[PDB]
Structures are given as structure tokens and as C-alpha cells.
Amino acid sequence: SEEAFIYEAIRTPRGKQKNGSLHEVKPLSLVVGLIDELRKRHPDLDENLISDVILGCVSPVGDQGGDIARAAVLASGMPVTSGGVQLNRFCASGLEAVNTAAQKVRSGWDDLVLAGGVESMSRVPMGSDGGAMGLDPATNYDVMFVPQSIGADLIATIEGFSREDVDAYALRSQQKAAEAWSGGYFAKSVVPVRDQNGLLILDHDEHMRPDTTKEGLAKLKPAFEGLAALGGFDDVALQKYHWVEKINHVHTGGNSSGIVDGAALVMIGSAAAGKLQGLTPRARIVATATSGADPVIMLTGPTPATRKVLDRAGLTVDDIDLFELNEAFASVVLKFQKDLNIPDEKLNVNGGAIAMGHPLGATGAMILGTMVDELERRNARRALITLCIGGGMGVATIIERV
């Protein structure tokens, strides 16, 4: 019954995959830079009261292996009692870390925890860690593994989302992200990345394409790179979804999330912990929920996770002011909106990963922090944050402005 509160939520800008500004930055440095910013905001914070640092990371190998969270605690000069643990629940890892931190606070056994994520996809590409679901034939065969982009195309086929429908949502994402940046919505929480000399490396989400046109999006070709370009995956998906004759391939590089680098950090604590440290709570974690759906279509987890977290908090869709769902693919957002009858003006109001990028292990903590700021900016009450997850999982979180 110990309420968990969000005291700080920040993130780096997202650097692009090709000729990106963050490619020269070690992912450890991305996390340490955000720790330095938190220390810069609360210099008199007794860091000995921080009992853990929980980082989501989807490819914890190489530069991101060996418990990068503990490396960040030690490299940043945080106390040796401050813990450090890495977790991987795929694209939801950043939000899972936040939820796990909030549940540790509610248990009464941890008082002040840092949570977030980090992902340098330009240095540690997706799939660098391997895995049995994809690489073990017995497991792959039995689970009917299908790349996520084909699940996204199957959703658009089943729900009747045309190529123009998903390209219309992508255009709105570019526009909303540009308006948020030009409006100053992100000025307080996007921390510029600098080198050891204080020289600027990156201060903006360089994956954005604010001049995107509906005509330009229509000229892009369907996704033909990676595992999706390989054979048999359409047949596998239709063997489970046997009432669908043919998959309409509507998703491209322009209506899917970008490959980017970035990190995010959130400070979570109890009321007594914040009062002892002169911290002002920005939001309260109302409820979390973990659920899932079919792993073949993979990307329909957000709906059952959202229903579960709403029932847990005793709320309905109408009680939520802002819905934030990661934009891995345009059809996933349109499906989620159709499932729950979500108004457009509540959904991803500041743009999403189609415009700004999807740094796997960090995204969940980025869009969580984005909703903390936007609730405070609008003086609104409740936000629901959720992400689609590989293997069909779903995670949802409700926060309430304080």
C-alpha cells in the first residue's frame, strides 16, 4: 500500500541508424550522461538512499553486455550500494523496468530506485544476442515464428487497414512530433548528448522527417530487408490464420518505427523517500499489468494488457486522458484504437517512434516520460502507456498527475 511516485523522467535525443550522431557514443556513456543530469538537477540528493538501478536492454551483448546497469552505477560514481540489474522483455523492457521499480517501491523493501533503458542499435544491431525462438529449429517450428513486420501486415489485412490508412497515420506522427519539438514540449526532458569536452554531439531527434508528404510515402516500397525478405514466413502466418487468403504488405520504412540509439532514465520513490530528499512528485503509478496474445501475430498484446490494467485500477477508457502506444508499426496503433474505440486526439499526441525512432530497451521509459510531461503541460489527470512486445506479450501502465 506504499504508493510509488515519479520524481524525474528524462531521455537522450534519438540518433539515427545511418550516419547517426550517436554511433560514436558507447551505450554506457548514454546512461551515465543521464545520471549526470539527474545529479545536476538534485546535487544534494543523498544517493545512498538509491537502492537499485534497473535498465531494460533488448540486446545485452558487447557494449551492452555484462549488466550495463551496474557498469553505469560504478562509472557514474554512484554509491556501491546502489545495485544495478539488466532486464529484457523485448520492446517493453524500458516500461517493464519502470513497473518493476514501482512494484519494488510498493513492496516497502526499496525506497528510491532509478529505472530506464538503453539501446545503441547502430552499434549493437537487433538480434545480436540470438535466441531460441528464432534460431532453434524445434522451437521456431513449433511456435510458428514470424517476423514482426509480417504480423503487422496481417493485422492490417484482417482489420482492413489500407496502404493509405497506415501512411496517413505515419504522416500524422511526423506532424505531431514536429509540432511538439517546435512548441517546446520536449525542452525540459530531452538532455543533449555531449562528449568528454562538453562539445555537442546531438541535441534533437535526427530521425524525424518533418517534410514528409502523402505522395512521398506512397512511393516507398514494402519492407524487403531483414528476416521479412526471407521465404516461408507468409505461409507460416496464414497456416494459423487460416481464414485469411493473402497478406497485404502495407508497411514500409516510412510507416514503421525507425532504428535509432538512445537512453532514458526515470527516478521512482515512495512519498517518505521524496519528502526526505526535498523531491516534488510529478506523477503516481496507479497500476501495472502484464498480459499477452497470440505470438504469431505477435503485435496484439497491448489490448488485453490495457483492459487488465484498467480493471485493476477500477477505471474505463473514458477515465484516461492520454493514450501512449509505441509506434512499432502503423497498423498496431490503428488496431489498438479500433479495439478500444480510442479517439484520435488522445492517442500519441506528441508523435511517436515512426517520426522519432524506437530504441528498443529505452522506448518504454521514453514514452513514459513523454506522458509525464504532457500530463503536466495539459494539466490533465491520467495517462495509459503500453507497448506491443515480441512473442505476443503486452504491458500497460497507468499514471496519474500529482
Partner: protein
């Protein structure tokens, strides 16, 4: 451990020459072929013990055979009896076999395989344990690992060694997944053997000569396989390599694409063993392979496929359905009536077998196009190196097209392949009945019209007989032979022998409308159309067909079969029942057939059916289909849809047995697999009953319980015949 099974005649002759080279000549005295039976394991165990004991005086080993073949397969009679409680004994047996080969492989001296004839399954695995393989380039010699065709896998190191030799992808796709057989020249190209000799007399001398040269040129590496050296690199990479890891997730999906989701466990087991084995050392990989082998042998699917593709095929090829006592009769000249795709293919397989063929049609240009069918096949075979120019010219020279009935002079074996119409077949046969030889076979490629009625159009009805081929004839291996009421046994034997001569598999059927294949395959397509009329999604119906294991989904097949033909069959079925004094009850599919005909969408030949067609290509289901039959209003489980199609044919097969249409379950199983497209994992539509495995249990009793469950839910036509009850 031990080189022996526990603690049988001798099948291996030992010979050590003055140079120190030991020749192991395999010659099982109990059979015409060397097999991996109890005698071989004991004989090889003693030979390997002696190689170790005398290692100081031995410089090389030659593994040869004294039989027509090198070594052909294992002991299916034993494997088919392995129960799940016998998994330990099966595991121990293949571990012992591979321990023998591993010792032979690591003797510190070169071992050469002298492959004089066929080396299939365990026979090739023996040669793969050697360091060098020499094959005699003689006709009829085949090399390969066809274990997958019995529901098994190469459990004597075949998976592990081919993967070490070629890498995961090449070994699986080209060798293991389909059990591909290779000619000696074809095997040398892919690296399955290393060199060829013209005659078998050169083998053992060339094996000793290679050993002698190997000891002089490569002393440090003599007798060391590539995967036993430091710094071995697996071709294509290991699963940890970034190159292979990028494409490895698509290997099971490509497998599911080729298998269409059918419940056949052997290919999945082979791929798993191959990749899991590539992650560990050789000895660990081999033991993983043994565990997957044991999983298959004790499973029901392997017992279905061993029964059908080994025992039932053997009983048929031995003449089980051939008339007893009757001798052979040579065929001097074959005459084919009709130059369509059926007759053109019949002329091809006949000429390929060495027969003279007169291909007749009502147009010389049409008859020439028929021979052009064989020309295009031979050009394809010549371009792939599967035949020679001299052999190809002799094949085509045996096909003479004509449009003149007088050119049928000298024909002693007629095969008519015209439109399925009795009055037409009567006039076609009457044109040449007096021109062909007096005792000429009068064969008819008929799918449903009873042979007794067709035979009345000829004078010598004793020589009239049904000879039913399947399209495409050059690739379909079944010939359905139908005996008319007056068809003589001498005629049946002559067509039976012709079927074996052209390399096909015969079944013998007694005269009945629909025979066996057309009647049983009709219940398959009719069951799908009934589901369409009930409101089941057309896409689910096609998926149920492919995931059951059929080679083509039923709605696609219905378009090819022509719905006008299906309507005429239903008319003839109704006429036969009420002419016999009975009451005809129409199948629910007939209303669907009539509706599609009324709409003008009668199949692929007309250009519109359940699918749309454009540029001679099938281009998706007709979008108006869902509104015509209210698709989606009925959503039964996919397994119920699969079971409805499988049980319908299995029940109909049992009725054909009960009526005397078929005389053996072997003919029922092979006929259903090769002619009807019944899924091979079942072992045949009769084996499906005794081998049924479902939620209700296993065996005939479980089949009957599931049949009664389908009957209560979908109609009384699923009620089992009395012959299946206690």
C-alpha cells in the same frame, strides 16, 4: 562401452595383404543385399575389434561389398516393432552402430569405401564414416539417405556427417530433407563421393592405390576427417556465425512452406538434429542424432510410412495382385489413341521404357504436339544432365505420330485416352479393333465409366481392360487396372507386367462405377464443397486440405476436375441407385456444384471456378464466393475440417474393401497415396484407420469413436461401416 550390442552369422570377410591394407568385404549370406541387421552389427563389431588389436600391422582399410549393391538400408522389420517402451533399446542400438563407425573413422589411418552398387541409408552412412569414397559409374547405382521417406532420419551418423561435410543448409535441402537419391556422377558433383571408376573391377585396386598415395603425400593427415582437425570450419558457418544466424530463422519457415503444415515429424526432427548437432562437438552431435532417431522410430507416423512405403510397396511389386501362374508376354508395339496431355504422357513413359509407340489423333498436327510433349521433357532432361543425346534421340525415335488408323498395324497393346464418354470410346475402339493384332490388349484410360459397358463396343471383350493413368503421367507412379466382368486373367497379367516395365506401381480393381481412386477422391472434394455450402470460409477449406497433407487444396482441385464432370458423376450415381430400386440421397455438395454451374463458374477449363484465372494462371479465390455461400457464418475447428476430409476417404476406402472393389489393404494404401494424393504420413487411407492417433486415443477403436463424433456433428455419412465394429 563396447563395439557389440550386449554381453548370428558372419557377414564380413577379412583380408590383410602384405602391404598391411585390410579389405572388409561385406557379404551377408542370409540375403541378397547387405542390411544393418543383427548379423552386420556383430560382424562389424568383431572386425573393428580386430582393426584395433592389429593396429601396428595395419596401414589402411578398404570397405567393399561382394553383392550386386554396396549396402541397402537397415532392418525395417525390427524398427517397425519398436514401441515407446523400447526407446532405450533403439537408442542403444544406433549408438553401438555409430561407435563402430567412429572407431573406424579415428583409426589414425585412411579408410576407403569401394562403392560398387547402391548405397542407401545405412549403406551410405558406412561410406560417410570413411575418409575417401570411390564409386563405380554403373547403371542402376543410387546413393542417398532416403530414411525420411519412411518417417525416419539417418541415425547412423548420416545427419551429423553430411552437416559436417556440407553445412546445415546444403545437407538439409539437398540430401536429408527429401532423401534424394543420386547417380554416381551426380553424387561426385555435390561431393558425396570423391572419384569414379568405369567398372567395379577397378574399385578395390583404386582404393588401395589411393591409400598408398595418401600415406606418401599426406602422412600427418592420413585417416583424419576434416571435422577432426584443429581449425575446422563448417561450410556456411555454425549457428553462432553472423552469416548463418541471419538466415537460420527462415529454415523452419521454409520447411513449413514446403510441407504446408502437414503433421509429418521426420523433416522437423532432421532439421533440429542438424542444427543442434552443429553447435557441439562431433560425439555430442551424434548422440543428439540418436535421440531424435529414437523419437521417430517409436512414433506412429514412422509406423505408417514404414508399412506403406516399405512393406505394402514391396508386396505390390512382388506381384501380390497379379494372377497366379500366368507367364509373361512381350509387347512389340504400343498404340495410343488420343494426343492430349494424358495420351502424350502415356506415349512418353512407354517410349522411355523402350517400347515403340504409335501416337494417333484425329489431326496430324495434334499428334505432333503430343510427341512435342516428350520433346520438351527430353530437352529439360538434357539441359539438367539427366540423360544423354544418344539416349534421348532413341526415346523420341520410338514415338511415331499419325492421324491414320491404318498405322496401327502391328500394335499389340492399345491405350485409349480420349474424352470420358461411352459412345465416343465405342467408336474410337471400333475404328482400330480389326487393324491391331488379334490378341492385342484393348486398354482404356477411364476414370469412372464401368469397363463392362465399354467392353461391349469391341468384339474380344476378354482383352478389354481399364488402364487408368494420372496426370502428369511422366511424374505420377500409379496405374489403376480395372477388370471388366469379362476381362481375362491373361489380359490382367499383361497390363500388370507393362506397368512394372514402365516403372510404375499397379493396383488391381474390380469393375464398379468410380473404381477406387475417382470414387474416393470424390468424397474428398464433395466434403470440401459441403463445408463451403455450410458457410465455412473458402480460405480455411483450402488450408484444411493442405495441412491435412494433400498435394493440392480441394477447391483448387475441383476447378481442375471440372464441375461439369462432377455434375455428370452425380447424375450417373443417382441413375445407378434408383435403377437398382433404391432411393437416392444427394450429397450436400451437389447443391454447391449446381450453384456454381448456374453462375457459369464451372472450373479452370472454362476460365472461372472457385478461383479466378488470368493469363493461364490461378489468381486467387473468386471474391463473390463469400457472398454466394455466406462464408464465415460457420466456423468449425480446423481439426474438424481436416478430419472430415480424411475420414470421408478412409470410410469410403473401407466400403471399397467391403464391396470387393479392392482385394488388399496394400492396394488401398498405395493406391490412395499415389493416385488419390492421400497424405503419406497416414500410410494410406486403410492404414489411417489402424494407425489413427487423436484426442480419443489410438487404433481402430479410436478411429470409430472419432467417426461417430464427426457423424453426430456433421452428418450420418461419417458413421463407420459394420466391418470396423467389434
Amino acid at each position: 562401452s563396447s563395439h557389440h550390442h550386449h554381453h548370428p552369422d558372419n557377414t564380413i570377410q577379412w583380408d590383410k595383404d602384405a602391404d598391411g591394407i585390410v579389405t572388409l568385404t561385406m557379404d551377408d549370406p542370409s540375403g541378397s543385399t547387405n542390411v544393418m541387421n543383427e548379423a552386420y552389427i556383430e560382424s562389424m563389431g568383431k572386425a573393428v575389434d580386430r582393426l584395433v588389436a592389429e593396429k601396428d600391422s595395419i596401414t589402411g582399410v578398404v570397405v567393399a561389398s561382394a553383392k550386386k549393391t554396396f549396402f541397402a538400408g537397415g532392418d525395417v522389420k525390427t524398427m517397425i516393432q519398436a514401441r515407446p517402451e523400447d526407446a532405450g533399446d533403439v537408442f542403444n542400438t544406433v549408438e553401438t552402430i555409430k561407435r563402430q563407425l567412429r572407431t573406424l573413422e579415428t583409426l589414425g589411418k585412411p579408410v576407403v569405401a569401394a562403392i560398387n552398387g547402391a548405397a542407401l541409408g545405412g549403406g551410405l552412412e558406412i561410406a560417410l564414416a570413411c575418409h575417401h569414397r570411390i564409386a563405380a559409374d554403373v547403371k542402376g547405382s543410387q546413393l542417398g539417405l532416403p530414411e525420411v521417406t519412411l518417417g525416419l532420419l539417418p541415425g547412423g551418423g548420416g545427419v551429423t556427417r553430411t552437416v559436417r561435410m556440407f553445412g546445415i543448409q546444403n545437407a538439409f535441402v539437398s540430401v536429408l530433407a527429401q532423401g534424394t537419391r543420386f547417380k554416381p556422377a551426380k553424387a561426385k558433383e555435390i561431393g558425396l563421393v570423391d572419384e569414379l571408376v568405369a567398372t567395379v573391377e577397378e574399385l578395390v585396386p583404386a582404393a588401395k592405390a589411393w591409400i598408398k598415395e595418401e600415406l606418401k603425400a599426406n602422412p600427418d593427415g592420413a585417416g583424419v576427417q576434416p571435422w577432426d582437425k584443429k581449425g575446422y570450419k563448417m561450410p556456411g558457418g555454425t549457428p553462432s556465425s553472423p552469416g548463418l544466424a541471419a538466415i537460420l530463422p527462415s529454415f523452419p519457415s521454409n520447411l513449413r512452406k514446403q510441407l504446408k503444415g502437414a503433421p509429418m515429424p521426420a523433416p522437423r526432427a532432421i532439421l533440429a538434429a542438424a542444427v543442434e548437432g552443429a553447435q557441439v562437438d562431433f560425439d555430442t552431435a551424434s548422440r543428439i542424432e540418436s535421440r531424435y532417431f529414437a523419437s521417430l522410430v517409436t512414433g506412429q507416423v514412422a509406423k505408417n510410412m514404414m508399412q506403406a512405403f516399405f512393406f505394402d510397396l514391396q508386396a505390390i511389386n512382388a506381384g501380390g495382385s497379379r494372377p497366379e501362374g500366368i507367364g509373361k508376354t512381350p509387347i512389340k508395339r504400343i498404340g495410343v489413341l488420343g494426343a492430349g496431355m494424358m495420351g502424350a504422357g502415356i506415349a512418353y513413359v512407354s517410349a522411355k521404357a523402350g517400347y515403340e509407340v504409335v501416337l494417333k489423333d484425329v489431326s496430324l498436327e495434334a499428334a505432333a504436339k503430343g510427341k512435342g510433349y516428350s520433346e520438351k521433357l527430353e530437352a529439360k532432361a538434357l539441359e539438367r544432365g539427366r540423360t544423354t543425346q544418344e539416349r534421348s534421340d532413341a526415346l523420341l525415335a520410338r514415338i511415331t505420330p499419325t492421324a491414320d488408323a491404318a498405322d496401327f498395324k502391328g500394335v499389340d497393346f492399345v491405350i485409349e485416352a480420349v474424352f470420358e464418354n461411352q459412345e465416343l470410346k465405342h467408336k474410337v475402339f471400333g475404328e482400330i479393333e480389326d487393324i491391331v493384332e488379334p490378341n492385342a490388349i484393348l486398354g482404356s484410360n477411364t476414370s469412372t465409366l464401368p469397363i463392362t459397358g465399354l467392353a461391349t463396343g469391341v468384339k474380344r471383350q476378354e482383352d478389354f481392360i481399364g488402364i487408368h493413368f494420372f496426370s502428369p503421367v511422366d511424374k505420377m507412379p500409379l496405374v489403376e487396372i480395372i477388370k471388366g466382368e469379362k476381362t481375362s486373367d491373361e489380359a490382367l497379367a499383361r497390363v500388370f507386367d507393362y506397368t512394372l516395365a514402365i516403372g510404375k506401381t499397379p493396383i488391381v480393381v474390380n469393375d464398379s462405377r468410380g473404381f477406387f481412386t475417382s470414387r474416393v477422391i470424390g468424397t474428398f472434394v464433395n466434403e470440401a464443397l459441403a463445408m463451403l455450402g455450410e458457410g465455412v470460409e473458402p480460405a480455411s477449406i483450402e488450408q484444411a486440405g493442405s495441412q491435412a497433407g494433400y498435394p493440392a487444396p480441394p477447391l483448387q482441385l475441383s476447378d481442375e476436375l471440372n464441375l461439369e464432370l462432377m455434375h455428370k458423376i452425380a447424375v450417373a450415381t443417382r441413375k445407378g441407385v434408383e435403377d437398382a430400386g433404391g432411393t437416392y440421397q444427394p450429397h450436400p455438395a451437389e447443391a454447391v456444384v449446381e450453384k456454381m454451374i448456374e453462375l457459369g463458374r464451372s472450373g479452370r477449363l472454362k476460365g472461372a471456378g472457385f478461383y479466378e484465372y488470368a493469363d493461364g494462371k490461378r489468381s486467387g479465390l473468386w471474391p463473390g464466393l463469400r457472398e454466394t455461400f455466406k462464408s464465415g457464418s460457420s466456423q468449425p475447428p480446423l481439426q474438424d475440417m481436416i478430419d472430415r476430409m480424411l475420414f470421408a476417404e478412409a470410410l469410403e476406402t473401407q466400403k471399397c474393401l467391403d464391396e470387393g472393389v479392392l482385394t488388399s489393404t496394400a492396394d488401398a494404401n498405395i493406391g490412395s497415396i499415389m493416385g488419390i494424393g492421400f497424405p503419406p504420413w497416414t500410410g494410406g487411407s486403410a492404414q489411417f484407420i489402424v494407425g489413427y492417433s487423436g484426442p480419443a486415443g489410438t487404433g481402430k477403436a479410436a478411429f470409430v469413436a472419432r467417426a461417430r463424433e464427426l457423424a453426430a456433428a456433421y452428418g450420418d455419412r461419417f458413421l463407420p461401416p459394420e466391418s470396423l465394429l467389434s
